[PDB]
Amino acid sequence: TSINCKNIQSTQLTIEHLSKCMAFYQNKTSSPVVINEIISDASVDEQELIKSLNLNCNVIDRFISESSVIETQVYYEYIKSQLCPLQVHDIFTINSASNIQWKALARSFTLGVCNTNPHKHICRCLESMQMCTSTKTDHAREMSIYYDGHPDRFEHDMKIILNIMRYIVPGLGRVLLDQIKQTKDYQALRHIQGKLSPKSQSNLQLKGFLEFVDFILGANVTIEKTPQTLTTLSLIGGWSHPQFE
Amino acid sequence: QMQLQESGPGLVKPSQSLSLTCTVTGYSITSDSAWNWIRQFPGNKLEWMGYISYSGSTSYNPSLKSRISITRDTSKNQFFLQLNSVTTEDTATYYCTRWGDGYYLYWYFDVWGAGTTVTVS
Amino acid sequence: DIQMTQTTSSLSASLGDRVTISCSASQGISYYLNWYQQKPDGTVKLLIYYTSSLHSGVPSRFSGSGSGTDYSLTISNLEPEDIATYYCQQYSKLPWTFGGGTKLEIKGGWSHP
Ligand SMILES: *[C@@H]1O[C@H](CO)[C@@H](O[C@@H]2O[C@H](CO)[C@@H](O[C@@H]3O[C@H](CO[C@H]4O[C@H](CO[C@H]5O[C@H](CO)[C@@H](O)[C@H](O)[C@@H]5O)[C@@H](O)[C@H](O[C@H]5O[C@H](CO)[C@@H](O)[C@H](O)[C@@H]5O)[C@@H]4O)[C@@H](O)[C@H](O[C@H]4O[C@H](CO)[C@@H](O)[C@H](O)[C@@H]4O)[C@@H]3O)[C@H](O)[C@H]2NC(C)=O)[C@H](O)[C@H]1NC(C)=O
Ligand SMILES: *[C@@H]1O[C@H](CO[C@@H]2O[C@@H](C)[C@@H](O)[C@@H](O)[C@@H]2O)[C@@H](O[C@@H]2O[C@H](CO)[C@@H](O)[C@H](O)[C@H]2NC(C)=O)[C@H](O)[C@H]1NC(C)=O
Numbered sequence: 001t002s003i004n005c006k007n008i009q010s011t012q013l014t015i016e017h018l019s020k021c022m023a024f025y026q027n028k029t030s031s032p033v034v035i036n037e038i039i040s041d042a043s044v045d046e047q048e049l050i051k052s053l054n055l056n057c058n059v060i061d062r063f064i065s066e067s068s069v070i071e072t073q074v075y076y077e078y079i080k081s082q083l084c085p086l087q088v089h090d091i092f093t094i095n096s097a098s099n100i101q102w103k104a105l106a107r108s109f110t111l112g113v114c115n116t117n118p119h120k121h122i123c124r125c126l127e128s129m130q131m132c133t134s135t136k137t138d139h140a141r142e143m144s145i146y147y148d149g150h151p152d153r154f155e156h157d158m159k160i161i162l163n164i165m166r167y168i169v170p171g172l173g174r175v176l177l178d179q180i181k182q183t184k185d186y187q188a189l190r191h192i193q194g195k196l197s198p199k200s201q202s203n204l205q206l207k208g209f210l211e212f213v214d215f216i217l218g219a220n221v222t223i224e225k226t227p228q229t230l231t232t233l234s235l236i237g238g239w240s241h242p243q244f245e
Numbered sequence: 246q247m248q249l250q251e252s253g254p255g256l257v258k259p260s261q262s263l264s265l266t267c268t269v270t271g272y273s274i275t276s277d278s279a280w281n282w283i284r285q286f287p288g289n290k291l292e293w294m295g296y297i298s299y300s301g302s303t304s305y306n307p308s309l310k311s312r313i314s315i316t317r318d319t320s321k322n323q324f325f326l327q328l329n330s331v332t333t334e335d336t337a338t339y340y341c342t343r344w345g346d347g348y349y350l351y352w353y354f355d356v357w358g359a360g361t362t363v364t365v366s
Numbered sequence: 367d368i369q370m371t372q373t374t375s376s377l378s379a380s381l382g383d384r385v386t387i388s389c390s391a392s393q394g395i396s397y398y399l400n401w402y403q404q405k406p407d408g409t410v411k412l413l414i415y416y417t418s419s420l421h422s423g424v425p426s427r428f429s430g431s432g433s434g435t436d437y438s439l440t441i442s443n444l445e446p447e448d449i450a451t452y453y454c455q456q457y458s459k460l461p462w463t464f465g466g467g468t469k470l471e472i473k474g475g476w477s478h479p
Binding site for chain 3: 290293353
């Protein structure tokens with residue numbers, strides 16, 4: 001049934017069900033909930049641990065990214081979703097200061113599809129942050145031929161897109177995106193980008209970026225997942241699987 | 246249901262320390278939050294002086310960082326401000342408040358003292 | 367460090383009016399802001415925390431708003447107890463700073479019942 005981000009089952013750890021535990025997907029806009037009430041039902045030693053961490057809304061993301069265990073990261077993500085709602089949903093308001101980071105990553109790195117016809121709608125959308133309304137409508141034919149049949153030329157732009165998205169969804173989202181880059185399974189990105197589109201409908205540039213990510217994900221190519229040989233630094237195991245509840 | 250009060254001398258003329266005692270009634274400083282001293286200068290200008298945490302961590306405004314000291318007594322459940330090398334600029338109304346850490350209650354200044362006006366020269 | 371500026375130092379308005387007080391920030395605070403009321407006798411009590419949220423016990427007339435570097439406090443209908451100096455605070459990062467303060471005063475008019 002529904003996933004519980006406080007205690008997550010071993011079968012449930014996948015990019016999709018983890019994607020369901022992201023902070024913005026919790027649909028909490030307002031009225032922050034204090035940490036002791038968030039963790040209220042959980043082991044006592046765990047509660048004392050979280051109090052000893054002295055989480056704040058600013059650095060909770062750093063705690064998520066530094067942790068080595070995915071269940072704990074999801075827990076901190078849920079604590080962020082209940083504790084810091086304005087921070088979580090700020091990115092969706094157009095030209096809010098949360099957008100500056102992924103916009104800057106867009107300007108800093110140019111797609112390989114943009115070295116041919118730099119005036120393509122998307123290339124202007126990442127370059128100048130203008131004409132972002134519909135990126136996948138304009139020149140889609142040309143991009144469709146460019147990306148189709150080429151694994152490498154597609155993986156390059158996909159990776160850069162994955163970095164910008166790392167800056168769009170901090171915390172859990174970031175780590176999931178990292179998983180993509182390492183596992184080279186790029187279709188799982190749907191679960192991240194899909195949920196991002198309905199919240200972002202007000203933001204024009206974000207909506208355009210997400211529509212294009214939808215487009216380049218729909219490219220016609222066959223790429224092989226490369227799960228890690230170590231089996232470590234992956235979601236399944238090892239090692240510890242904390243369950244708070 | 247807690248309340249705080251500041252107990253302090255009326256004035257000290259310059260080159261001396263000014264010390265105040267914030268007594269916290271109805272709460273345990275050990276248990277949680279951050280305990281702060283905040284002075285309002287004449288003309289209604291507010292300045293955050295510094296705080297001591299529930300665990301004893303100290304953070305001071307870098308403007309005052311040299312001469313300011315904030316201690317606490319867990320026994321009588323008090324915490325003390327000492328601002329040394331006072332000048333005529335330090336004349337002001339000094340409060341002591343509680344900044345909540347995000348654990349038991351959100352981040353803000355919750356309970357405030359009535360304030361004690363201490364003067365220089 | 368982070369300088370908070372209240373554009374209006376002092377303001378007068380009649381009772382029952384709708385008063386708005388503006389708080390500007392030197393840089394982006396990312397929504398971390400508080401609103402305090404210092405009455406004439408000197409008692410200071412928290413009005414608004416986290417920029418939207420209203421503290422427990424604060425009357426329904428007060429509403430916070432704003433985002434980014436710009437923030438607003440709104441008293442919907444002005445009652446005589448609200449006459450006081452108001453302050454805004456950024457907890458973004460230390461050292462914490464306060465606004466210059468805004469003192470409220472009465473116009474106020476004459477009673478003609
Ligand atoms: C916080 O809020 C969000 C949003 O409000 C909420 O997420 C929704 O949750 C509900 C309840 O679980 C979901 O409703 C179910 O949806 C089932 C299938 O949904 C399909 O459509 C999704 C949206 O498609 C839109 O976009 C396309 C463009 O592609 C557009 O053309 C369409 O018109 C449409 O507007 C789609 O995202 C979804 O795909 C899944 O995979 C993506 C990968 O990208 C990932 O984002 C999600 O995991 C997503 O689920 C899917 O394709 C629907 O079938 C079901 O209704 C019936 O289902 C069975 C079918 O047989 C019936 O038997 C049964 O009786 C039901 O009647 C149900 O309505 C809704 O899809 C979610 N929306 C999302 C995820 O965007 C969160 O739950 C809220 N948070 C919490 C904690 O609750
Ligand atoms: C998706 O791409 C395939 C691959 O096209 C190949 O690349 C061309 C440059 C040229 O070398 C073609 O001869 C290649 O076939 C498109 O071709 C068909 O793909 C389907 C399965 O996707 C397969 O069953 C057919 O046999 C392929 N056709 C031939 C002649 O082999 C396919 O049309 C593309 N699908 C789209 C664009 O929707």
